[PDB]
Symmetry: D5
Subunit: 195 residues, 10 copies
């Protein structure tokens, strides 16, 4: 039986720990992001394979999140010292190079267990991404098995859709992008859309 504190439409489970932020160690906590959307994602291990490509994909596109009031934080079970060393490893060596996303350390595994992403037999997490709104409420959960990375395009579309539906109180159909048709969640009002 799988156990987690992470529930959609409930407050995201609180976390705090040491992150590497612009080459320095800093205390970071979930509530530092109140007032903004947060994309909080776990990756298995520093110095491995799919993991740097995802951090780099989000990092290189960070201004696309920051301009819609959204922050990104990545997390693995490695220490902050390992995070720093990986950052100071050239991208060509499978390193990260300099990076604008905080890398949070979950050495005690408590944060992983709370978000239900810890693999007990391996001692690290799978690829779990969490979208948390400006009120600290968990809106979306995406978990991938180890071999397959996530999509920045898809995360962006999700954040946009949650902020849109937050604002207008209509609902976003399958595949919705900005500029797409939405639905009034009324059995009479829905007919606008379905005609």
């Amino acid at each position: 039986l799988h156990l987690s504190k992470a529930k959609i439409s409930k407050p995201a489970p609180y976390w705090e720990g040491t992150a590497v932020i612009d080459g320095e160690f800093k205390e970071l906590k979930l509530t530092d992001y109140r007032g903004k959307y947060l994309v909080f994602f776990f990756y298995p291990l520093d110095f491995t394979f799919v993991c740097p490509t995802e951090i780099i994909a989000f990092g290189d596109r960070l201004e696309e999140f920051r301009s819609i009031n959204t922050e990104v934080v990545a997390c693995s079970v490695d220490s902050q010292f390992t995070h720093l060393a990986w950052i100071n490893t050239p991208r060509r060596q499978g390193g990260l190079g300099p990076i604008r996303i905080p890398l949070l350390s979950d050495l005690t595994h408590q944060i992983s267990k709370d978000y239900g992403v810890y693999l007990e037999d391996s001692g690290h997490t799978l690829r779990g991404l969490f979208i948390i709104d400006d009120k600290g409420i968990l809106r979306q959960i995406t978990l991938n098995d180890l071999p397959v990375g996530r999509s920045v395009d898809e995360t962006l579309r999700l954040v946009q859709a949650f902020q849109y539906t937050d604002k207008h109180g209509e609902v976003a159909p399958a595949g919705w992008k900005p500029g797409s048709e939405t639905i009034i969640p009324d059995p009479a009002g829905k007919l606008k859309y379905f005609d």
Copy 2:
């Protein structure tokens, strides 16, 4: 504390029930899909709002899954009788019209609870999608809060990536599509990619 039987890299929890399949009631079970990938997704309620758009999006693109050895099954807590009535409601009335995807009924809520998608306060599920491989192993889990639909494009990309990595035993970086570069999961072999 959230509880489920659904664990990535473990066998997907077994299910069986009545589905509507080409306008008829039929017994359907998870293991009927052994040997093929399965996209198994839950939606909140027949005769509601985001729900028909997702069923229709997958349904209208079904041959794109069937040609990569992948089936799709949708599920809600409504009865098979309600599923049939919704199918026999014109798309213009927010109905489904004829549909090639089985609609599985989870009236006892046991299947929802097993997949960890049941909302105890509402009596139906959230938007939870599950990708299960040809061996019955759970590979990917996507859960959306009620207001925001899923993406057929993204589901397809995920299925493709899991089947690719199944076959070649390399790993798929962030945003991977067919034709994209992969990584040899070796600290020496990974350097091919990172150069």
Copy 3:
């Protein structure tokens, strides 16, 4: 063992939920009925067979209840959206047509379990009818297996008898209808009836 909170001669178990009333979604509560008798009945499932005939029979004869200060509420495990769709289905198609009885939705199954009528293996209720007096006290319980409908005539006879015996403190013999002999519940007084 079978369990229920519904005990004859004790206050009927409190319920509240969404009902379709006049084609609109309203909160409805058991306490809205204080001051009136209430026939509160569960039926298995919208869009089925015996179920429409029973709802229609009570609806079409509503005045016979209302003119003796009695209201009627029907309940299934279906959603309020499925209720509304059934109401908008013509009677020729097994729909209800417009209806003057509230259709209460018990989607979480709380109400059905409190009344002891929920079938664990099927995920819906059997045919359970409850007669609740104006003080909120449960007077009568009628439970039928699935294939056999209830009787509006028998329900009305029971309501009238509970009303007559509430008022006069005589008791009602077998088959009593308005205009029939009653019995004074005393070893001396009973002799007036039996001679």
Copy 4:
């Protein structure tokens, strides 16, 4: 919480006891009735008010049940000796007179408690009636608060309905009597009834 062993669609709870049958004490068992429908009914107390009218009502119309392969048995918490005294009491004194219906004695209360009809505060049953099919399965439960008697007509209508639906596998609409239209419990076949 209210507890009982009696569940519709399951074997009626087994019982055995002393009954008065044609003036004599005999051991009577629920399994004596295999092969026949059984109307099994409890009444509060010998030498009381509604109770003799219900026993007489069923008694005088017994062949109406016996000619549709149905037996009737009555039960109260009173002793076999009290039952026999009551039989030997003239109808004109609230007595029973001779009757063809067995009066089963439930002095220990185990039968009452098994059928969920025992009133802990009072030490006797309410008016509970049970229709049990020829396979020993419970089909119908009718519980009345003390002041209001049951109906022979209605019991007869229900027995006929269960027998018809057993034999023809159609279902019986609200109010159904012999010669009334039934419904084919299929979404297509139902339309013959509804149209």
Copy 5:
């Protein structure tokens, strides 16, 4: 393991219920007897064999108790309506005829069980008699198997003996009757009797 609340030397267990007293139903309580001795006895069943002989033997000799400030109450598991019908049955038919002793009803079995005289296999009491003093303390317990009646003479003897020893603080030898020698309960004082 046999259990009861009735202990010699301790307050007799409280009881209350409905008795037939001069043809009427009245609430009777143990505390109604404070200030008087009470012979409180159980008998198995109304309309049986030994039982009317005992009730009639104490009833017909009631003045032998009242003139020594002693009341008599009889109790069985039968309803008060059965007690009244028994009273209205002529002695020649095994009835009681009018009786001056209250007949307490113990339909719920609570009083029988508190007095340790309830027979779980039969659903009624054995023949248990209890002598309770004016202060409410249980002094004497006599329990007989079903086939053998008790003795009014022996009961009188015991009451007279307890009243004598209460008043004079001497003790009553085997077979003591009024006018008989008693013993000063003292290793010195006793010699007055034995010498």
Copy 6:
């Protein structure tokens, strides 16, 4: 709560111990008496007051028991050495003198506690007497508070009544003595006695 193993109509609780029999110490067991009725009685303490008079009353009339195939055994918590001293003490000093009834010693209190006659606050028994049949079944229980002794006449009457009803299968009315009428325990048969 008062606890005991002694229950009417159930085998009398097994006992064994050392008794004084014709001035000698002997191993005695309840089962030694199988095949005959036994009057087994407890008295509080050797060298006390009511206690010798009861033992003497039975001892002096022992041939009245023996000639109806009934034995008598007395028991207290005192040791067998105390029993012997008391027997060797002249009747005029509250001693027993020679005696033909066994005096059983219950020094460990096990026998007293099994028979429910032990007084935890005093460390000895009250005056309890038991009538056990030839099959070892307990038929009668008489418990007196300390100040009041038992009756040999009443005990003989009970033994005679049990033996008579054992033999003829009729039952014995209140105050029955040898030569009195008995009752056939049958609703028709009983009318022989009452008419």
Copy 7:
């Protein structure tokens, strides 16, 4: 496992009961002896064998205890009435004759069990003796199996030794008697004695 409340150097377990003192029954308590040493001893049974010789041995030499401010109390499970009978029995018949030591009665066994001397299989005590100081602290425990009696000389020697070491704070060597050398309980001080 053997259980007791009596522990050396801890307050002796409180006791109270009825003793025979100069031929009279009197309430005695352990606390009556505060301010003086007490030799408290149990013997198996009145009217037995080693038991009288021990009581007589102490009784005859009681002034040797009294003159060192020490009292003696004896106890068995026998009743106070047995104690008195035994005292009133001449020494030449194994009786005690007059005696100046209280004979405490432990009829309920509580005192024996508290002192750990009670023999569950026999229902009396072994030969146990306790030396309790003026403060109520248990100082010495001597337990003999049944066949072998205690020693007044040895008991006097112990009481004298406890009182001496209580007064001078030195300690008493093996076999110390009044007038023998004692030891200063100090690594240097001890050398006075040993050298």
Copy 8:
């Protein structure tokens, strides 16, 4: 609550450990003494005050035990290395000097606790002596508070008494020594002694 395994009449608790025996470490066991009486005694601590006097008093008188087929073993919580250093300390310094009695070491405290002589607040034993017969049954227990030594004379007296009563099946009066009168344990036989 005081606990121990040592009960008079039952096999003495098994023990085994390392003893110093003639200057050497040897494994010693209780069963090594079968066929002989054993005086087994505990003393608090090596290098203390009363303790060497007791060990020396039994050692120096060992032939008084061996010539009646009795061995002596002393035990404390001290290590065997401490026992040996104590032995190699001259008597004049509070040492033992060479000794013919084994000194058992109970470093783990298990033996002390089995014998109920361990003092939890001090971490050593009180002065507890145990007389065990040739069959291994515990016959006698003597426990002294710390400040007061035991008596070799008393110990000899008890051994001689137990051996005499074992052989002759008579019992030993208070103060018995060899050559003293014993008692035939019989209410008749006893008169030979008392008369």
Copy 9:
């Protein structure tokens, strides 16, 4: 409370995991070391401060262990990928450089908890060293708080002493080094060392 499975003089707790050996990932097990002494030490974290100096000190002095049949294994909670990256970091940068000691990865924390060295609040181990003999038995445990490194010289001294005492069965005094005096563990033999 602190818990561990590592007990001196008991078999060292089994472990197995992935190690970096010769720059490659290998399964390694405690049982691979049977036949050799093993120094098994935990260090807090790769890429830190005291940790490289200790690993380097043992690595650079490996021959001193291997020439006396002793191997060395280091362990932290870091992944094998972080170990490999640290090994590929030059010593001038706080890396290890190539290394001839296996670096075991304890990512699940199982091994660290089994050895009692895991710090719950920090998510890594303290400085814990374990010396395990050739039979797999744990001989020595050294635990240091974080800021203070261990000593290769002290470890080597300990290994040599355990080897010398395994071989000769003499014992090693404080500060013993090869060539120093040893002690024969006997009270007589020890005198050769101490004179």
Copy 10:
């Protein structure tokens, strides 16, 4: 499982006991050492082998600790009396001679068990040494199997290292001694040491 209260980085477990200090018995408490470092060490047994050499080693070099504000205390399960005897034993006989180090006694074993050094099978401690800082915090634990002594030099090196790191907040590399290079525990500042 092995349990202990001693955890590095937490307050050393509190202790108190009798110690021998400069030839005398004194109560000694762990809190007596607040304000100073404390080397607290356990040794198996007085009058044994390695144990005196370790105490002498620390004893003779005491001022080396006392001049760096550090105290030393030794402890074994032996009594204060045995400790004093051992002190009074010439060094040439494996005795201690005078020593300035307190010898604390742990007769009850509570201190040993609290520090996790007690050997349940043997009844004494292994060789466990604990370095406790001036704030009462545990910094270092060294446990040796019985055959191998500890090192004064190494203990001294550790005390100096903890004192240096306390005061300067740098960290001490493997092998560090006074005058050796330390490390600044920061990823940038570390490079001064490593380069």
